[PDB]
Design a protein around this ligand. Structure first.
Ligand code: ZN
Ligand code: ZN
Lengths: 404, 404
């Protein structure tokens, strides 16, 4: 069995060239449809063309390089837009991996026939509308976004596209008869891969998410003259309630469950005033839908129990944008695991993705999978960038070969 | 024994006339040395003159009406400036009580000889410099304040006094050979008097105060990708620490001890970021100096214990302006208690003052005492305003009569 061979110098050169579009100190500033982002997309489309793909920036700003080869296709990609404080490998890694994998599989006689498409989905980070590109590709609803989405400066997405020259450009869309699998390589800086000192992660599931505000309504009072016994301190209620959350969630959790109080506000927030109101922001995530729902039910029950006992009233508010867990395709995961075991024996693991990605959108329509490399100024050692691409290329060869 | 008789109509008329200077909806806006405050001070000085006192607005804006009678003097007063959100009786009550008591003792043949002075100390509320008037009166340091104190608009106190016409006016100062006692009537809205459904409080001690910031230094992390086990969540440390405070302070407290977390801030305060830093503001008050110091020592010890165990570091910062408890004169308290028992039998109690007052400054130089009436839009029933003045006038007669 002959396997393809990536060119590690070519891979790193392209990653560093993409970094130069928007490089700002230790990171990259490249917001969707900004002039520097469009510049990077034109460069990327040229590189896809150089590789022999049919490439263009589409009507929403996605860069898509379609194979010219017949038969079933594997799509490899990620995003190349950033947040205001982006790093040089978030998103860029999987886009350039996809390009190099397309090149390497085309250069190996045994894999030369395999169709590989490469994608940079526009606006994964949501400068205008989160996952605009992957939503557009799979045919999810985008009409509201195209009509009324704005960025931080209030610039309409529709106006941004016209300014980028994309106003009358067709959008690339999924062809379910042709495109049969999706692979998204991505960094992980969060820590699980790093904390395990492993080099390769095979993603099992992209976690679901819940967000809530929890409000506490008590009574303002003078902090000096009001005896402790008659107080209705909303901030004291809030702090006590967090311990109830930790207890109930700890009973339901496994080692991967996460939950976070990201914000606490006391009103009025003065030394000499017992707070009459208080609010916390709560997020939690888990890969297991039963557990995620049981955590929500436990939180609802905690609020009802609290309100049956205490003078400070508790009020739970669901935030828009809850997400369910999204599993990665089991057979694709196993191709990734076989490649990881072949090329990184003893240095790979299965793990959930604690963050959201375009793959969570695409996976609901075609088989999808993700491959993680660790990140430690976001960064990854060059030899680990190379190893990640070697594993991804080997798996891609096997995945694409299996489609026939 | 003949006792003086206040005129309750005259008392209420003066309280309502003073309210008209700055009346704003349900309250009063009358900041020290503002045009409306100066207007009220000119009116007040005229009323003192009408009563037969030697009255003037002094070099710092205090209104002082000095008795023309020989021998030892009782000073009765409070403040007539407000905070931006003031009520019509905070401060005003004791100023107008003092005026009416001076009038009533002068109208009774048995008390006609007794010297009674009446005061409105400037800027108890600290629009420029807290307790400026009572500090100036007792000869505490005010030179720094006169030179560099500013209000919210940055207007210098020295400039404000010149604009009020007070630039070359002598300051009234304490004469310890002549002025032998101070009585400050005041409302209490905080609740102890109200919660007990009593009508008269005899103040034992003005509580001491401590304020601290407590900072927690952990590590920022992505709230989705960072496993719970490796977190250094500064907000979780903060919340856990509050429970330690409550436990340690509860062991030291009696029913009157107070402590309050008035503010909590998590950094950065986002749903998806484990907070890397967190800060709370803590205040506590007590009438017992040993307990107040033991609470401070317990807090220091809690920080040291925390730092010997946890990954998130704790850092305690003392705030300027700590205050010690200040006892009210025991013999004056007993005159107040005798009058309260005579005129409000079964409806009075001893109690600390949980708030600061000019009396805490004056008490360090001459015998001082305070008398509280309840407050429920800050307000007090007219019959309870009248009863408070009847009790204060009877006590004043006995206090002044005892000085000879
Ligand atoms: Zn990404
Ligand atoms: Zn006051």
């Amino acid at each position: 069995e002959d396997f393809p061979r990536i060119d590690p110098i070519r891979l790193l050169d392209d990653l560093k060239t993409l970094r130069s579009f928007g490089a700002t100190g230790p990171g990259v500033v490249r917001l969707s449809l900004s002039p520097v982002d469009i510049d990077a997309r034109r460069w990327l489309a040229g590189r896809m063309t150089d590789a022999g793909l049919d490439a263009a920036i589409d009507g929403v700003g996605t860069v898509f390089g379609r194979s010219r080869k017949p038969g079933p296709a594997l799509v490899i990609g990620s995003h190349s837009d950033t947040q205001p404080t982006g790093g040089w490998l978030d998103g860029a890694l999987g886009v350039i991996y996809g390009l190099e994998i397309a090149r390497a599989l085309g250069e190996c006689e045994a894999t030369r026939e395999f169709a590989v498409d490469v994608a940079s989905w526009i606006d994964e980070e949501g400068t205008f509308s989160s996952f605009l590109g992957s939503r557009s590709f799979v045919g999810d609803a985008i009409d509201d976004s195209l009509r009324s989405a704005r960025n931080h400066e209030g610039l309409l997405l529709g106006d941004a596209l016209a300014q980028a020259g994309l106003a009358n450009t067709p959008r690339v869309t999924l062809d379910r008869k042709r495109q049969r699998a999706y692979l998204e390589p991505h960094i992980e800086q969060g820590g699980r891969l790093e904390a395990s000192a492993k080099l390769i992660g095979v993603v099992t599931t992209i976690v679901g998410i819940r967000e809530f505000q929890l409000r506490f309504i008590g009574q303002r009072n003078h902090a000096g003259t009001t005896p402790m016994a008659i107080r209705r301190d909303a901030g004291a209620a809030l702090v006590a309630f967090i311990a109830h959350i930790d207890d109930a969630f700890g009973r339901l959790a496994d080692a991967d469950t996460v939950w976070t109080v990201g914000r606490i506000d006391l009103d009025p927030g003065s030394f000499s005033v017992v707070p009459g109101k208080a609010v916390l922001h709560l997020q939690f995530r888990d890969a297991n839908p039963n557990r995620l729902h049981a955590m929500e039910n436990a939180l609802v029950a905690l609020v009802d129990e609290w309100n049956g006992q205490h003078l400070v009233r508790a009020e739970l508010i669901a935030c828009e944008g809850a997400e369910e867990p999204v599993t990665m395709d089991a057979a694709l995961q196993q191709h990734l695991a076989q490649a990881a075991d072949a090329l990184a024996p003893g240095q790979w693991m299965h793990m959930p993705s604690g963050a959201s990605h375009d793959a969570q959108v695409i996976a609901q329509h075609i088989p999808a999978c993700m491959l993680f490399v660790p990140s430690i100024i976001e960064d990854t050692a060059e030899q680990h960038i190379v190893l990640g691409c070697e594993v991804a290329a080997r798996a891609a060869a096997r995945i694409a070969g299996a489609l026939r």
